[PDB]
């Protein structure tokens, strides 16, 4: 229902990026977090990761 739920996801595809520590050292993992915003007053976090879901 609607392109917002259809999503450009079909065009994008998740990708991988470097993490500082992957446990034992760095690695090129898709879990990598690009940016984090913390402006909401209720304590919720908005994380932007390199993968999609």
């Amino acid at each position: 229902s609607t392109e917002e739920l259809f999503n450009e996801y079909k065009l994008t595809r998740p990708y991988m990026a470097r993490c500082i520590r992957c446990a034992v050292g760095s690695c090129h993992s898709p879990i990598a977090i690009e940016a984090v915003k913390s402006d909401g007053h209720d304590g919720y976090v908005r994380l932007q990761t390199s993968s999609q879901y």
């Binding site: 470097r18 500082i20 520590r21 034992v24």
Partner: protein, 53 residues
Amino acid sequence: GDSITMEFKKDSVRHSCSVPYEVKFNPVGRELYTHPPEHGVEQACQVYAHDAQ
């Protein structure tokens, strides 16, 4: 942290053990960081080798 807790799952109720020991690692360099940065300069340090040698 202030203490170290180690645990593992047996064939029954999980077992754990905590011992009091001060854990406080000195950041490498003249800058006091919590986790290593994504980017930086290479400086000499002393670390525990994982090699069984």
